[PDB]
C-alpha cells in the first residue's frame, strides 16, 4: 500500500534539449535549444548539423528525448564544444527513431533491380520462417 501516481512524463522545452527540425532549409537536422523566447518561440542552434543559430517557432521542430549539459544562452562555438563532448550524435544515431529514418531513406534509394533482389530474399526468408512457425 504505497500510493502510486501515474506520471505522464513529457519531453521538456529547456536549454540543452535537442530537437529535430521539420520545415525549411534545414529539416531532418538536429539542433539544441539555447534560450527560450516564449511559449511559442525558442532560440535554436545546431552547428555540427549545419543549421544556423536562429529563432524558431516550436511547432516547426520536434522535441527529441535527448538532453545535454548546456548553459542557457551559450554561443555557437560553445554549443559545438558541448555537443561534441556529450556525443549526442552517436546517441541519436542509436535510437529507433533515427534508425527508422535511415531505413526508409534506404528503401527510397533502391534501384529497380535492387527492389527485385529484395523480393527474392523475402521469398527465401519466408520459406524457412514459415517452417519454423509450424513445428513448435
Amino acid at each position: 500500500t504505497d500510493s502510486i501516481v501515474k506520471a505522464s512524463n513529457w519531453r521538456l522545452v529547456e536549454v540543452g534539449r535537442v530537437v529535430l527540425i521539420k520545415k525549411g532549409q534545414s529539416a531532418g537536422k538536429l539542433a539544441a535549444i539555447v534560450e527560450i523566447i516564449d511559449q511559442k518561440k525558442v532560440l535554436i542552434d545546431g552547428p555540427k548539423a549545419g543549421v544556423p543559430r536562429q529563432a524558431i517557432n516550436l511547432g516547426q521542430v520536434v522535441l527529441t528525448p535527448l538532453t545535454f549539459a548546456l548553459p542557457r544562452g551559450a554561443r555557437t562555438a560553445t554549443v559545438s564544444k558541448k555537443w561534441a563532448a556529450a556525443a549526442v550524435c552517436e546517441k541519436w544515431a542509436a535510437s529507433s527513431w533515427a534508425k527508422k529514418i535511415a531505413q526508409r531513406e534506404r528503401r527510397a534509394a533502391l534501384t529497380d533491380f535492387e527492389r527485385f533482389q529484395v523480393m527474392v530474399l523475402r521469398k527465401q526468408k519466408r520459406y524457412t520462417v514459415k517452417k519454423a512457425l509450424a513445428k513448435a
Binding site: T1, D2, S3, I4, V5, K6, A7, S8, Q39
Partner: protein, 191 residues
Amino acid sequence: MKYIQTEQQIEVPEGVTVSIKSRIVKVVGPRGTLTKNLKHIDVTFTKVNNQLIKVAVHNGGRKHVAALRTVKSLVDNMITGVTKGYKYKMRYVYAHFPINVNIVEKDGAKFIEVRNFLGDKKIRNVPVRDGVTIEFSTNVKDEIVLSGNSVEDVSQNAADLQQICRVRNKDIRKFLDGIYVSHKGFITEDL
C-alpha cells in the same frame, strides 16, 4: 495570459494510500474508501512521496488555473473523509406543529419520512443516500444527524431533507418552519 505552470499540494496522512490512473482517483483509509473521477479536468498528478502529491497545470488560463485549487480541495475532502469522516447535524424548527421525523423502509431502501410539517396531512420523503447513515440524536431535542465518508453524499442528503421542508404560500419570514442544517463537522472527535 496563460501561466506557464501553477501547482498545488495534497498532503497524505499516515493511514491512507491514494492512487490515480488516468485521472480516476482512489483514496483508501481507515474508515473505508471512496473514488472520484477527474477526467473532465486536465491537470497532472505527481507523487513526490508517500505523504505528498503535487497537482499542476501547464500553460493554463484563468478558468483553467482556477480549477486547480478545486481539484486539490475535492481530493483533500476524500482524504479527510476517509480518516475523520463527516457529520452533518440538523435541528427541526417549528412554531406550533411538532415536526415528526422517522426512518422507513420500502423494498429495502431507508427513507427519511417527515410528517405533520406546518400541520400538513401529506407525508414527506427523502431517501437515505448510500454511504450516509442517520442517527436521531439522543439527548438533544429535534436533532437529526447524518454521517459518512463522503462530504458530498452527506451534505446532499442533508440538503434534500431541508428542501423537502420549504413553505409555500406563506410569509417565509414569519413562517420559519423547517429542518435546517445546524452544524457541519467531523466524526472522529477531539479533531
